[PDB]
Amino acid sequence: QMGRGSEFGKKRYTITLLPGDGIGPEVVSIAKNVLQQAGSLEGVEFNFREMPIGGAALDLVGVPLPEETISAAKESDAVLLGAIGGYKWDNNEKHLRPEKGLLQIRAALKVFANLRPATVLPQLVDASTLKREVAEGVDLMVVRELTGGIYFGEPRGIKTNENGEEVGFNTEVYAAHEIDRIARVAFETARKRRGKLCSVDKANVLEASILWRKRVTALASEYPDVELSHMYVDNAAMQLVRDPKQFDTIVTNNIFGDILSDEASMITGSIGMLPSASLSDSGPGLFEPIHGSAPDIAGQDKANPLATILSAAMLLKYGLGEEKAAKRIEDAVLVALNNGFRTGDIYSAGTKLVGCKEMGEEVLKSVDS
């Protein structure tokens, strides 16, 4: 009669926080607070656990992703990551660079489905370098295959041939089952939006893309409410500039996903607003802002926390099925922007320039009202 579960009708989730490097800890600290407050309003409690990753892990135990961090992440209900990278580690051997830890945690958590929404918010339309009429109303979702393809393909390496010359190689490889699963996510995703899915590949050159297109095509019959189309990656790169409003959902591989989602991100004009979700089958998902560790403003209360806050909303929605709590966060971010609040990266003439903590305070204020 109090509700499901064993704590007075409340739901308690275990969250692993991976603040990381640069501005990561600052923005995660704020999102944590917004998460707690919005959750509390829906009868949701959290056990948080901070663990090291990236440069922080390197300075601590000499690897970018400690076994103990993986264990903690795997035993959790969801993972919220801050940011990865710094100048200090830039002359390290490549297994000892912060980015390595990020690739390793994706693989370890088997979060093959990366969701990256790119929307132009009406309050920030003028931040885009695209003309207003082209940028306004952009609202697309890139579904990127995150744990396969060339990023993780074998064989790979740099070797010296018999002529004494170096040869570097990587393998773009996909098994049918890897394509099917990311395709299914994208079809389900498009179904819940405008019902349009664009599969992006290089099928006029690459056998790996021919298989991609074959499997995606064969799945279309299981989603008759979804209009499937296909586009070559180079044409997709042009169409994002020419008419980004044409897209609802895009599905593509690891490397094309990396390039196109980042292109779509910059087209919106405000990188500091953009969240992302990485989902697995049945295990904890990984949620993180798409921006970097921005080391040059670290510790200066300058960072935009909104992308991480919105990643926490994605954590609630996609990771935990806690939709009302997610909506409370999304609403509060909107109220802050409507009230004229802007951190430095989204500042325009006549708005209220605020620091990181102060922006969090405004979101918090709105959640609690």
Ligand X SMILES: CC(C)[C@H](C(=O)O)[C@@H](O)C(=O)O
CA dihedral 39, 43, 44, 47 (to 10 degrees): 110
Q: How far apart are CA 171 and CA 190, in angstroms?
A: 30
Cis? peptide before 98, omega within 30° of 0 = no
Give yes or no for a contact between 239 and 207, defined as CB atoms under 8 angstroms apart: no
205 binds ligand X (CB under 6 A): yes
175 binds ligand X (CB under 6 A): no
Q: Nearer to ligand X by C-beta: 126 or 234?
A: 234
Q: How far apart are CA 136 and CA 143, in angstroms?
A: 22
Residues of span 57-96 touching a copy of itself by CB under 8 A: 85, 94
**Does 86 show up as a binding residue in the annotation?**
yes
Q: Which of 21, 77, 201, 258 is catalytic?
A: 258
Segment interacting with ligand X (CB under 6 A) among 66-74, 97-105, 316-324, 345-353: 97-105
Residues of span 268-307 touching a copy of itself by CB under 8 A: 271
258 is catalytic: yes
Q: How far is CA 21 from the centre of its chain?
A: 17
258 binds ligand X (CB under 6 A): yes
Q: How many residues bind ligand X (CB under 6 A)?
A: 7
Q: Side chain identity at 312, as an amino acid letter? A: A
262 binds Mg ion (CB under 5 A): yes
Q: Which of 11, 32, 100, 202 is catalytic?
A: 202
110 is written with which tokens? 């088997």
Q: How far apart are CA 85 and CA 331, in angstroms?
A: 31
Q: How far apart are CA 59 and CA 190, in angstroms?
A: 42
99 binds ligand X (CB under 6 A): yes
262 is catalytic: yes
Segment interacting with a copy of itself (CB under 8 A) among 28-36, 137-145, 184-192, 256-264: 256-264
Q: How far is the CB of 4 from a copy of itself (least distance, A)?
A: 39
Strands 275-279 and 285-289: antiparallel
Q: How far is the CB of 232 from Mg ion (least distance, A)?
A: 7
Give yes or no for a contact between 150 and 209, defined as CB atoms under 8 angstroms apart: no
Among the listed residues 67, 207, 281, 368, the single contact to a copy of itself using CB under 8 A? 207
**Does 174 show up as a binding residue in the annotation?**
no
Residues of span 293-322 touching Mg ion by CB under 5 A: none
Angle at 280 between CA 317 and CA 199, to 5 degrees: 90
Q: How far apart are CA 190 and CA 186, in angstroms?
A: 6
* Numbered residues of the known binding site for NAD(+): 84-99, 204, 235, 288-304
* Numbered residues of the known binding site: 84-99, 106, 116, 144, 204, 234-235, 258, 262, 288-304
- Active-site positions read 151, 202, 234, 258, 262
> Rule CB under 6 A: which residues touch ligand X?
99, 102-103, 204-205, 234, 258
